[PDB]
Amino acid sequence: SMYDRHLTIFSPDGNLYQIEYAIKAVKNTNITSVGVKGENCAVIISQKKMATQYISQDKLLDYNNITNIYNITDEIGCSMVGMPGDCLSMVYKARSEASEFLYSNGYNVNAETLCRNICDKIQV
């Protein structure tokens, strides 16, 4: 048709090109994050760099505020890479998910469950 790449509808080969374009948009930010897992610890390292976008890095920009790492709860953390507005939106969604889980179930969500709930939201 004329919109198989504009909308999230299948292309004749069975692809969803908008998802690939969103992945390319994430890749274009030129922000790198690395997560490692130890025996009893897990570490996430990221760049204190501004995702490449229409605006550039100014001399008067506060570089301590630049961060791609967030607390979802006191005991769960994340690193988000992509369009900064989308990253903030996802962080808020994850925080609200964790808080709703805590209130509803009387205990704190774990990272696996939080990630799976976020992906269930993304599927929509």
Partner: protein, 256 residues
């Protein structure tokens, strides 16, 4: 009396090898306010009979005065020890009083225990009755009194009345009554009876908001009616999970 204002909590009476053991805490509550902490809730009618009450203190005092004057008249007319009224006689009197007041719908807000010795063949205490001097307060052995010669009777607000080997009022009628229906046995010694009563009173102190651990024990025996020295029951909690600090429980959820 339209209802209870100042009230006393449960009473427990049981039979044991030497007579009657009756216990009550010395507390009268004006609602949730423990206003009076040294109240007497067991009264001596004569040398072989005691009365315990749970409910309105004013109605209990009215009944106590009635029984005191009944005993005085009995003593005035007495010629031999056999003429003294028995616990059964006093129980019948109190039951009739309660029945008539029920018929008038002017009840006494009380549950009454009338306990004592239903016999004159174990002592000569009623040969010469002293009302204003207690010679007991010179120690001879107690007499093993037959269970059938003892008497404990219960009267309630509607005039329902009966007798048994042990009687309870108030919340004792649940806690102490369960413990007694399990563990009571005939011809218990004084120490065993006291231990059973102390267990019952401890459970009452833990689970009843209107009780105290300041306990009055009264023994009706061949020596007569003896009031023990009131004592504080030691009541310690039976679990360390109670004492466990709350901050050591998980901070998430309804851990309280």
């Amino acid at each position: 009396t339209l209802g209870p204002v100042v009230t006393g909590t449960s009473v427990i009476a049981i039979k044991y090898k030497h007579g009657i053991m009756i216990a009550a805490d010395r507390k009268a509550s004006y609602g949730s306010y423990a206003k009076f902490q040294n109240v007497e809730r067991i009264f001596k009618i004569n040398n072989k009979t005691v009365m315990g009450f749970s409910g309105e203190l004013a109605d209990a005092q009215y009944l106590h005065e009635l029984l005191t004057r009944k005993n005085i008249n009995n003593l005035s007319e007495k010629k031999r020890k056999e003429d003294m009224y028995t616990p059964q006689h006093y129980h019948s009197y109190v039951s009739r009083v309660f029945y008539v007041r029920k018929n008038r719908i002017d009840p006494l807000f009380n549950n009454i225990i009338i306990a004592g010795i239903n016999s004159q063949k174990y002592d000569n205490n009623d040969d010469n009755v002293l009302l204003y001097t207690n010679k007991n307060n010179n120690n001879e052995e107690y007499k093993e009194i037959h269970k059938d010669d003892l008497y404990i009777g219960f009267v309630d607000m509607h005039g329902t009345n009966f007798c048994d080997d042990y009687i309870t009022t108030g919340y004792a009628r649940y806690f102490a009554l369960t413990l007694l229906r399990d563990h009571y046995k005939d011809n218990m010694t004084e120490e065993e009876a006291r231990i059973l009563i102390n267990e019952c009173l401890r459970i009452l102190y833990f689970r009843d908001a209107t009780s105290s651990n300041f306990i009055q024990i009264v023994k009706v025996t061949s020596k007569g009616v003896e009031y023990e020295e009131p004592y504080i029951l030691p009541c310690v909690l039976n679990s360390a999970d109670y004492v466990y600090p709350s901050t050591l429980l998980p901070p998430a959820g309804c851990m309280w």
